[PDB]
Amino acid sequence: MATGDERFYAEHLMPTLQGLLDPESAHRLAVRFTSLGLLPRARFQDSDMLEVRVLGHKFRNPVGIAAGFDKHGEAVDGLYKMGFGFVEIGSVTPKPQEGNPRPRVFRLPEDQAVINRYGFNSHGLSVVEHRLRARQQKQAKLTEDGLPLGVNLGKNKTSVDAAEDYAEGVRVLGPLADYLVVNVSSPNTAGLRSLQGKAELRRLLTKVLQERDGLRRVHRPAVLVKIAPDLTSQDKEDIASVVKELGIDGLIVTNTTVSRPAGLQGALRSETGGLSGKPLRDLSTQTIREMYALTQGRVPIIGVGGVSSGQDALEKIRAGASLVQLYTALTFWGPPVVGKVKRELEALLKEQGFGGVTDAIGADHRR
Numbered sequence: 001m002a003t004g005d006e007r008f009y010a011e012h013l014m015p016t017l018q019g020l021l022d023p024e025s026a027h028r029l030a031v032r033f034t035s036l037g038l039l040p041r042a043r044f045q046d047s048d049m050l051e052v053r054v055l056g057h058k059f060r061n062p063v064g065i066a067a068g069f070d071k072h073g074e075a076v077d078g079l080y081k082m083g084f085g086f087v088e089i090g091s092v093t094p095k096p097q098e099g100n101p102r103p104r105v106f107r108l109p110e111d112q113a114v115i116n117r118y119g120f121n122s123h124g125l126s127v128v129e130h131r132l133r134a135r136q137q138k139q140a141k142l143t144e145d146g147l148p149l150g151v152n153l154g155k156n157k158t159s160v161d162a163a164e165d166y167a168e169g170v171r172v173l174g175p176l177a178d179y180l181v182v183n184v185s186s187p188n189t190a191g192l193r194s195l196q197g198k199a200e201l202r203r204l205l206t207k208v209l210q211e212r213d214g215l216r217r218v219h220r221p222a223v224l225v226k227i228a229p230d231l232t233s234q235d236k237e238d239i240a241s242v243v244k245e246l247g248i249d250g251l252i253v254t255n256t257t258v259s260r261p262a263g264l265q266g267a268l269r270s271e272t273g274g275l276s277g278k279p280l281r282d283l284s285t286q287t288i289r290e291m292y293a294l295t296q297g298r299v300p301i302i303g304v305g306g307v308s309s310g311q312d313a314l315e316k317i318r319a320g321a322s323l324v325q326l327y328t329a330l331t332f333w334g335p336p337v338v339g340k341v342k343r344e345l346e347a348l349l350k351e352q353g354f355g356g357v358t359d360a361i362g363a364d365h366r367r
């Protein structure tokens with residue numbers, strides 16, 4: 001019966017509507033429909049096995065919506081209604097900006113992948129601040145109930161001082177967030193990924209952390225850094241070193257890839273931008289695995305990239321992720337994928353002898 005509307009969405013509704021609508025229009029409609037609560041509430045009730053305690057919070061389940069789906073904080077409540085254990089909004093830039101010219105998003109259905117080059121289209125900090133303020137106390141209760149909120153920060157295209165952009169984000173949205181993400185891994189703003197370099201990252205994160213530490217206790221979020229899947233071994237070593245040196249609270253692993261893996265079939269494979277979905281999956285999992293080992297398992301990781309099944313989620317958890325996110329799978333399978341991942345993950349945890357998600361975190365490293 002759950003499998004179910006899964007089949008209807010996956011085999012008929014989503015393919016048909018994707019046939020009618022370009023991906024950007026489709027995404028806007030999805031955000032709209034989700035924000036209005038037009039989707040029926042998720043039948044799957046989260047078992048205690050799926051609960052995770054990390055980043056100073058309880059997470060009712062470990063499956064979140066990745067940044068980029070709700071860039072401007074318009075659909076947070078509808079996303080919880082869809083069954084996500086946590087919601088991340090953004091990336092948000094300090095000033096509003098339009099992003100790159102169209103077209104800028106492409107489906108690769110034969111690869112179960114997407115390529116995007118949005119370039120941080122953002123309503124800006126002020127608009128998002130007011131949107132989150134309008135439901136701040138509702139979010140306080142949701143968080144207390146095991147449904148935390150993350151806010152992902154970006155920087156403006158024309159900004160001279162990257163660190164000041166991130167600092168402003170901490171000041172404006174830090175007080176409304178359970179965790180903040182310093183997104184230094186978008187492939188679609190020139191020079192951004194260079195902020196992952198050791199010296200630049202250290203300077204940037206020192207400032208971010210100083211700003212965060214200046215917030216009142218009740219409004220003091222955890223700070224995570226979101227990294228690329230395309231880093232050298234040296235880059236990864238350096239990130240791990242800075243993270244430990246500064247006491248960064250966690251990592252989001254990974255953003256989209258600028259690589260184009262051998263075997264892509266989609267007609268649009270050579271479009272510029274970040275690739276997401278299935279071709280990113282194991283590249284992301286391996287990056288999680290490496291970051292977990294480099295941080296001695298002491299630094300919480302949110303694993304993201306190509307998750308569309310319980311198996312995909314559990315592989316990332318066993319590689320070292322405390323939580324996972326998805327986006328691209330939602331675009332192909334629709335809302336039922338959320339319950340699907342959770343049900344399959346629970347079943348696999350039981351089959352592999354885990355008491356719950358927490359027991360599985362980093363399990364591959366202890367074999």
Ligand SMILES: Cc1cc2nc3c(=O)[nH]c(=O)nc-3n(C[C@H](O)[C@H](O)[C@H](O)COP(=O)(O)O)c2cc1C
Nearest residue numbers: 066067068090091116255276277305306326327328
């Ligand atoms: C259309 C689109 C827009 C995105 N926008 C953002 C963003 O603004 N900030 C960010 O940190 N990641 C962004 N991402 C990356 C996702 O958060 C995620 O890291 C990546 O897509 C891998 O997950 P997936 O394979 O489940 O989509 C975006 C991805 C897509 C497909």
Ligand SMILES: CC(C)=CCC/C(C)=C/CC/C(C)=C/Cc1c(O)c2ccccc2oc1=O
Nearest residue numbers: 017018023026027030033105114330331334335
């Ligand atoms: C939240 C969700 C996936 C569906 C909500 C309800 C609804 C009526 C969706 C209708 C149409 C549709 C084409 C959604 C898929 C979709 C994309 O194809 C898409 C492609 C690239 C990047 C982001 C995208 O966002 C989407 O939601």
Ligand SMILES: O=C(O)c1cc(=O)[nH]c(=O)[nH]1
Nearest residue numbers: 118119120186188256274
């Ligand atoms: O806005 C975008 O282009 C974007 C940002 C980001 O962090 N990742 C991505 O794939 N796209």
